[PDB]
Symmetry: C2
Subunit: 121 residues, 2 copies
Amino acid sequence: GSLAEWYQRIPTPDDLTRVESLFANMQAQFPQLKLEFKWNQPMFTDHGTFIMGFNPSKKHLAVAIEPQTMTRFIPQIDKAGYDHSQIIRFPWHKPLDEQLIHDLIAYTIDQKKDATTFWQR
Amino acid sequence: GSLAEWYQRIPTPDDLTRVESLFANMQAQFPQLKLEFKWNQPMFTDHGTFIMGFNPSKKHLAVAIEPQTMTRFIPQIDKAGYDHSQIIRFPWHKPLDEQLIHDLIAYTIDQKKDATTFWQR
Ligand SMILES: [Cl-]
Ligand SMILES: [Cl-]
Ligand SMILES: [Cl-]
């Protein structure tokens, strides 16, 4: 894909305006950032390192951030009223590491032993 | 929707068998888990708290895990050779909080100042 085509996956003209303004404002606020197009999506990078990625869907703009950033901001993201998701991609065409999946479950079960809410806050 | 309807979203018979076996194997290993259907996807829960979510796409099974779990397991996920993603959903119909996006970028920039890889490892 190209960057021209990605912009065309944004559902409506007002949605495109929102993304264009966001990009422009963030570039103005962080002049060192490079807006690259990599693995078929726009990403801000800084001195050859990932900062943020972007992908549209029918109902939302998905903003991609690093694991440590997500961890640090959970309280502030929840307060702002936005849902978040952390996923591992298991390709259909590759083996499924069930030991890994098992270990993720076991660790989470242990950490949430005394949880009083459905989601980690 | 429903769990039946969700299973129909899995793209091939072999992919369906994979998902069926995975659920069965994890339920056998963790007999306390309930497989619930919430917010249009299957989720393992334990004593009413979230443990793991699932969703198919054309190319992969997406396994949803909590932020603390993703953070803990990055080295093991990378070693296993799977990609991972952490996203915030900014709905098109709701205001976009640019201060939050600014703060996320600023924090990530500071954290990556001395980074020697593209992605957090
Ligand atoms: Cl909750
Ligand atoms: Cl571990
Ligand atoms: Cl890397």
